[PDB]
UniProtKB/Swiss-Prot annotation, chain A:
Coiled coil: 1-31
Domain notes: The flexible hinge domain, which separates the large intramolecular coiled coil regions, allows the heterotypic interaction with the corresponding domain of smc6, forming a V-shaped heterodimer.
Family as reported in the entry's similarity comment: Belongs to the SMC family. SMC5 subfamily.
Summary of subunit composition and partner proteins: Component of the Smc5-Smc6 complex which consists of KRE29, MMS21, NSE1, NSE3, NSE4, NSE5, SMC5 and SMC6.
Note: Present with 892 molecules/cell in log phase SD medium.
Name of the protein in its database record: Structural maintenance of chromosomes protein 5
Function: Acts in a DNA repair pathway for removal of UV-induced DNA damage that is distinct from classical nucleotide excision repair and in repair of ionizing radiation damage. Functions in homologous recombination repair of DNA double strand breaks and in recovery of stalled replication forks.
Record localization: Nucleus; Chromosome
Boundaries of the shown chain within the full protein: 896 to 944 of 1093
Post-translational note: Sumoylated by MMS21.
Length: 49, 50
């Protein structure tokens, strides 16, 4: 079991980096568009109120 | 708001955040397995002593 879990270690260690990189890329793509949309709708809300 | 724009982005980000959650769960499981390896190292000297 020690050998098996020692082998299990690098496989899990290889993960959480590609996953986090993909998450960061998706968040970076998503953030500016909704940010500008929210800013525009908030400005319209203020100018209408 | 998410139906005015394409709603695929929210679905993809939800999939990625769930992947992050389960990956973090597997990571803490790996840390617990490492702690079990630690106790194995703590008992290997006892096995050699036996």
């Amino acid at each position: 079991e020690l050998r098996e879990l020692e082998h299990t270690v690098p496989q899990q260690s290889k993960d959480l980096e590609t996953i986090k990189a993909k998450l960061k890329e998706d968040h970076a793509v998503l953030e500016p568009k909704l940010d500008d949309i929210v800013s525009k709708i908030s400005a319209r809300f203020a100018r209408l109120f | 708001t998410i139906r005015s724009i394409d709603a695929s982005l929210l679905d993809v980000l939800d999939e990625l955040r769930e992947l992050q959650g389960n990956e973090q769960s597997l990571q803490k499981d790996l840390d617990f397995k490492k702690a079990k390896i630690v106790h194995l190292r703590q008992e290997s000297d006892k096995l050699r002593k036996s």
